[PDB]
């Protein structure tokens, strides 16, 4: 099973939750946002295959093709290697998308941008073909933005890695279905993007405090026979 391992160094994260007014955001980037980013990468890297009348259909077909290449509905997980904090901001997000209310109704609204210093993404594949391996490696790169246009994103290196069936704690995110048999963090995450579903994922984040601040440090989870190493240290990743 070829694993796409990439390091993302983006300062501020911007995808919000199922909410309004004050838009709470995810603690970790969602699989849907990463899937959309890779769909856009396929759009601007190989536009001959993906060329639709509207961008909505092109994005939908790219996401469908990616899911077809994906092992299962259970999508990619992420690994935060830096502490997480909630950074509430104020922006003039105009409220004009409702009925009436003229066309210029700008009000101050809250939308926090969690601060991240480093992050790792481990896409799980099913031994894809070589002729598309380099193309998808390049597409995984050049992810210039995540979430909204404000939150810039930038990669550093991407590579192909194998599990080699290593024993290590599962420091990634896994669906809360098989984890019953195994200081925990589970919530609805919206794995599947909606194009006109809601699966509870476990998050490896602890709100412990050492002296005065809590941030979000490691979780020290139970060991899993399935994992893979990088730069010496081994991360636990689940596969279906």
């Amino acid at each position: 099973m070829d694993i796409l391992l990439v390091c993302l160094r983006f300062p501020f994260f911007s995808v919000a939750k199922r909410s309004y007014q004050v838009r709470t955001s995810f603690l970790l980037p969602p699989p849907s946002a990463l899937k959309g980013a890779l769909a856009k990468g396929l759009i601007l890297l190989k536009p001959e295959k993906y060329a639709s009348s509207s961008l909505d259909e092109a994005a939908l077909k790219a996401i469908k093709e990616i899911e077809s290449k994906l092992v299962d509905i259970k999508a990619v997980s992420v690994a935060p290697l830096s502490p997480l904090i909630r950074n509430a901001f104020l922006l003039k997000r105009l409220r004009n998308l409702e009925s009436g209310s003229n066309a210029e109704k700008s009000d101050a609204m809250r939308r926090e941008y969690t601060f991240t210093r480093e992050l790792l993404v481990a896409y799980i594949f099913k031994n894809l073909t070589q002729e598309e391996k380099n193309l998808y490696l390049k597409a995984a790169m050049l992810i210039d933005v995540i979430g909204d246009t404000e939150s810039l994103a930038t990669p550093v290196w991407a590579s192909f890695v194998k599990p080699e069936d290593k024993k290590a704690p599962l420091a990634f995110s896994a669906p809360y279905t098989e984890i019953y048999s195994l200081r925990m963090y589970i919530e609805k995450m919206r794995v599947s993007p909606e194009y006109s579903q809601e699966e509870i994922f476990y998050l490896p984040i602890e709100e412990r405090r050492y002296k005065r601040i809590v941030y979000y440090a490691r979780i020290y989870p139970p060991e899993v026979e399935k994992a893979l190493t990088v730069d010496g240290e081994v991360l636990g990743i689940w596969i279906p």
């Binding site: 909505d56 901001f89 550093v156």
Partner: protein, 335 residues
Amino acid sequence: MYVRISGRIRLNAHSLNAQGGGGTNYIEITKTKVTVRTENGWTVVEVPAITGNMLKHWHFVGFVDYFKTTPYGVNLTERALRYNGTRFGQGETTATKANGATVQLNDEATIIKELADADVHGFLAPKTGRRRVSLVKASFILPTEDFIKEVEGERLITAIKHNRVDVDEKGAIGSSKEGTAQMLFSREYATGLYGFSIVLDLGLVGIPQGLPVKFEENQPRPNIVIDPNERKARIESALKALIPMLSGYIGANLARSFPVFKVEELVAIASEGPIPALVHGFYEDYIEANRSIIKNARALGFNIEVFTYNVDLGEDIEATKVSSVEELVANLVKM
């Protein structure tokens, strides 16, 4: 064409991007939390930071200003002239240009043909669809982690008060019952060396989002639905809009503050193909990350051209020395 710029700018005594305070007499500056290393310690520090909405709006203002100079400035919405840009909405299906010309929103091709701001900064038409994302993106403006480490604590924010005296006909001043307005407000002024990063995706300007190439004569030529001459004019206008970006035209309170602006260092890379974003200037080791990313891109077969201002970034990289941001704009507008 496709360019990306990241650097550090030394600006001080500025009052940008406040929380409004429309119901409060105290007007503070924006506050942000930063995690940083402290010699085996992960601490959080409070520093001001300009939101990317500000940078995008001011870049749009510069673009719409430089678009009036060219003779082809007629293709522009009347709304953009007033520094507006809400760009329709669910209940709007008609676009009004500068001359007052009705434009339908049936497809993105005609919209970008008749409008320039919509082509660059995007728009939405929830009534009919045709979603178009902005082709210019800006990161936030934060001080680098090195500056926070060097300063450790300390306020770095100066609270300065100004009064609004409104006397009566001869000399009579009143506080809260004479019907006059006498209020003494306080504004927070920030300093420090900040980091900025922007991605300019100009090569797609004038090309519909759904049809990047025409692909009719067995050759995937770009689907430039607009005149190539005024397409290049739009590219030049957007590139030169960056000139009043690294000069001190950012944020609010320009009349009373006018930030004392000076770019310290920057690295930019350009090419005609899709280019990865390099790094934010926030990180201390952003230069080594830039070197690694450009080395990887050039090893993967990318014709990257690199411009460097006040940085070495190695010798074996064929990087062009830059004397000022105007030098960078001049070198960019050659293509």
